[PDB]
Amino acid sequence: LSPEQLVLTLLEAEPPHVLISRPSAPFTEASMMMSLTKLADKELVHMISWAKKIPGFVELSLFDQVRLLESSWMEVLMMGLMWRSIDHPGKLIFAPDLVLDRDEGKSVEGILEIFDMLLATTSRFRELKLQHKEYLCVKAMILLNSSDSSRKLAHLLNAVTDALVWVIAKSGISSQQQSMRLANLLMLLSHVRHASNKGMEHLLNMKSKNVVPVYDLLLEMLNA
C-alpha cells in the first residue's frame, strides 16, 4: 500500500549475509574464480527468495518473473556488493569474510578492470551519501526495470518509484534538489548495468577457458 509500507516490506525482504571463507592460500586465478562463483550461486538462491517477497512480483506471469531475474541478476548482485562496500573505501566487501583489495584482482586476467568499475561507482554512491532506504528502492528498480503482467509490472515499478520519491522527500531538501538527487541516483544505475555487462562477458569468457566450475543456478543464469 503506502510508500512507507512498501519500503518496510523491502527492508524485511533483505537477504541474510552469505558466508564464504577466503582461501587459506594467497589467491590464484582459480581460487578467486571459485570464491566469486560459489558466492554468486549462493546469492542467486537468496535473490530468488528476495524477489518473491517484493509485493506483487509473484502475481506476474512465471515467464515475466523468470525474464526479470535472468535479465537483472548480475546487476542486482553488483548493487548488493557496492552497498556492502560503501562504508569501506578501496575494499570490495564480497562477503563478511571475503574482503578483496583493488590490487588482489591481479589474480584473474580482466577482473581488475571490473573491480575499478565497481570501486569507482561505489565512490559515486558514497559521495551522494546513498541512504539505506534509497538503496532498497534502487535495487528493486533494477530488477523490475530490466525488461495482465505488462500492466502489473508497470504498476509495481511505478510503486517502487513512488516509494523512492517519498524517501528522498522525507530528507526535506528543496523539490529542485529532490529532482536532482533522483536524477543522479538513476544515472548511476547506468554505471552499475555497464559493470554488470562487462562481468557477464568476463564470466562467459572464464567458463569458455575451463576455469569456471559446474554451478547449477549460476550456469543456468549465465546461459540466459
Partner: peptide
C-alpha cells in the same frame, strides 16, 4: 529448470 523450481517449488 532450477530457476523455475525455486520460483514455484521452494
Amino acid at each position: 529448470h532450477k530457476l523455475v523450481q525455486l520460483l514455484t517449488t521452494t
